[model samples]
Target: GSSGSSGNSESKSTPKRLHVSNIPFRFRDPDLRQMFGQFGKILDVEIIFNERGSKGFGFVTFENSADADRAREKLHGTVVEGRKIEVNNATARVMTNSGPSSG
Candidate 1:
């Protein structure tokens, strides 16, 4: 008997971007790029910083979805600056208003 299955059961889903949160206040775009760039080519990187020079959160875009997946697997829950990073696919939503528009 085979210990592993021979068929390919993996899904064909892919993610374009990932959201990283709980980053240290000192972490910058270069730092994040260096971390995630290890997995694949990073297309773009953005870090949200507060007026007081505190790091809020960041997002990373990869050349391909596979790269994003790899980064998520390796970076998520990893300790950085005494805080574990949160890595996940960026949720998409359309902007809407509760009240009728004046247009």
Candidate 2:
């Protein structure tokens, strides 16, 4: 069987935000930058926290989607500082929305 008109290419900007999970509690923003900087230019790095302390997760923003993809592929499930971290494409609205709104 052959499918007909099953998909169409939509024009949109690719997202470059990655969600990092299971990172060590000792990790910081600078550490994330250094780790991902090798792939491409880092726009921003944030290590999230709660009332108790670090959430052991963060988000990394890259200058382009290419870098984000590279980092995700290379860093996912990779060990770092005696811990293995998970990396994936972030689904946050901040990343997919097309606008100049500041957060």
Candidate 1 residue-wise lDDT, 19-100, digit = tens: 8888877788898678888887787888887887656789887777766777787898899877887887786521223333
TM-score of each: 0.67, 0.72
Model 1, C-alpha of 98: deviation from truth (Å): 28
Off by over 4 Å in 2: 1-15, 51-54, 94-103
lDDT at 85, model 2 = 82
Say which candidate scores most in lDDT. 2
lDDT of each: 0.73, 0.77
